[PDB]
Each structure stands twice: as C-alpha cells, then as structure tokens.
Amino acid sequence: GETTDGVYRVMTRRLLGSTQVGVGVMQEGVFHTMWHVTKGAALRSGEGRLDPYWGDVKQDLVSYCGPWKLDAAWDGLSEVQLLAVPPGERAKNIQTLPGIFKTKDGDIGAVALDYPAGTSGSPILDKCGRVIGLYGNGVVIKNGSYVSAITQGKRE
Amino acid sequence: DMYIERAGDITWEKDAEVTGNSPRLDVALDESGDFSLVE
Ligand SMILES: COCC(=O)Nc1cccc(NC(C)=O)c1
Numbered sequence: 001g002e003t004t005d006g007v008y009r010v011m012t013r014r015l016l017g018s019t020q021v022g023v024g025v026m027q028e029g030v031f032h033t034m035w036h037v038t039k040g041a042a043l044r045s046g047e048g049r050l051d052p053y054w055g056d057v058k059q060d061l062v063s064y065c066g067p068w069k070l071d072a073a074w075d076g077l078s079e080v081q082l083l084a085v086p087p088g089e090r091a092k093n094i095q096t097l098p099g100i101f102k103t104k105d106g107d108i109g110a111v112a113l114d115y116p117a118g119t120s121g122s123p124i125l126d127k128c129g130r131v132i133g134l135y136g137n138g139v140v141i142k143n144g145s146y147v148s149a150i151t152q153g154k155r156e
Numbered sequence: 157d158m159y160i161e162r163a164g165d166i167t168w169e170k171d172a173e174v175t176g177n178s179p180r181l182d183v184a185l186d187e188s189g190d191f192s193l194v195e
C-alpha cells in the first residue's frame with residue numbers, strides 16, 4: 001500500500017456513501033490514530049492491509065504495523081499548529097497557543113478549536129514539524145465549543 | 157471496512173491562520189478514556 005510519511009484520512013463505506021470517521025499519522029512505516037476512530041479494526045491502503053499492533057482505550061490511541069513512534073512533547077510555552085484534515089476539505093494548518101487540562105495525575109496541553117468529529121486524529125505540530133500529539137479527545141464547553149487534549153503516546 | 161487516503165505532508169506553515177484561546181480547565185479522565193469537566 002501507501003507507506004510514505006504524512007497525514008491520512010480514515011474512511012468507511014458502512015454508513016451513507018464514503019464517510020470520513022477520522023485522521024491519522026504515518027511515520028516510520030507505522031500508522032497512528034485515536035482508538036475511538038477505528039475501535040481497533042484493521043485498515044486498508046489500496047491493495048495492502050494494516051493490522052493493529054498496540055492500543056489503549058484510556059489513552060484513546062492505537063498504532064498499526066508497529067509500535068507507537070511519536071515521542072515529541074509540547075514545551076508548555078510556545079504556539080503549535082493543528083494540521084486539521086476536515087471531512088471533504090483540504091488539509092489546513094491552524095496556529096494556536098494551547099491551554100491546559102489540569103488532572104489529578106498531572107497537566108496536559110489542550111487546543112481550543114472547533115472542528116467536526118471526523119477531524120479526530122489530526123496531528124498537532126511544534127515549530128520543527130514534529131508531531132506532539134493528536135487532536136480529538138476532549139470536552140465540549142458551555143456554549144458548545146470544543147477543547148481537545150494534546151494526546152501523545154510513549155515510544156518504547 | 158475502513159481505508160486510508162493520503163492528505164498531506166506534516167510541516168509547519170508560516171502563513172497559517174492563527175486563532176483560538178488557551179483555557180485552563182480542571183478535568184477528570186475515566187477508565188473509558190472520556191474526559192469530563194470538574195468544578
Ligand atoms: C463544518 O464544520 C464546522 C464545525 O464542525 N463546527 C463546530 C465544531 C465544534 C463545535 C462547534 N460549536 C459551535 C457552538 O459552533 C462548531
């Protein structure tokens with residue numbers, strides 16, 4: 001199939017037409033997405049097949065063809081870019097300064113940008129183009145706006 | 157059956173639209189991976 005590094009759409013043919021359920025990141029031959037996008041199911045890339053390799057529902061992450069490769073982290077100070085890939089729309093970079101999710105187990109960066117559910121899995125980048133996490137697991141605030149955690153896995 | 161299609165290179169863009177605030181929110185994360193607002 002297609003194994004080049006980059007951002008990819010995740011599609012299904014089970015609902016009306018072809019529906020974009022999410023997005024992911026190919027890096028070093030491994031596909032990275034949010035667990036809620038695929039529920040751990042196998043994927044197709046042209047004539048090839050990607051099988052799940054690692055996943056965790058609490059972290060809301062899954063990798064295919066190999067272990068999780070993304071290890072960069074938000075510095076806690078600088079602006080980042082969401083490389084949003086919305087359903088039926090061109091990939092678009094949105095720059096923002098993350099907020100914070102404060103939890104009983106530590107603080108995590110959070111991005112306050114309103115994109116549709118099928119954008120889940122889009123990568124968040126630092127100034128060197130490294131992926132610091134995926135957008136698409138968070139909370140809906142008071143008026144209906146959305147705030148996503150910057151969700152990152154662990155590279156063993 | 158799910159499938160993937162390439163949508164771009166992962167690069168930082170100098171002319172990106174800049175927007176969004178930076179809220180500080182107290183949250184809880186449950187065993188099912190759902191976040192919820194705590195107050
Ligand atoms: C075309 O997609 C547009 C979209 O998904 N918007 C969107 C996404 C998330 C939240 C909100 N909220 C309010 C109050 O507008 C809007």
Ligand SMILES: COCC(=O)Nc1cccc(NC(C)=O)c1
Nearest residue numbers: 115116117119120136137140146
């Ligand atoms: C799982 O992520 C969900 C998400 O990314 N956005 C999201 C979440 C909640 C509401 C809306 N709204 C509209 C109008 O689409 C969008």
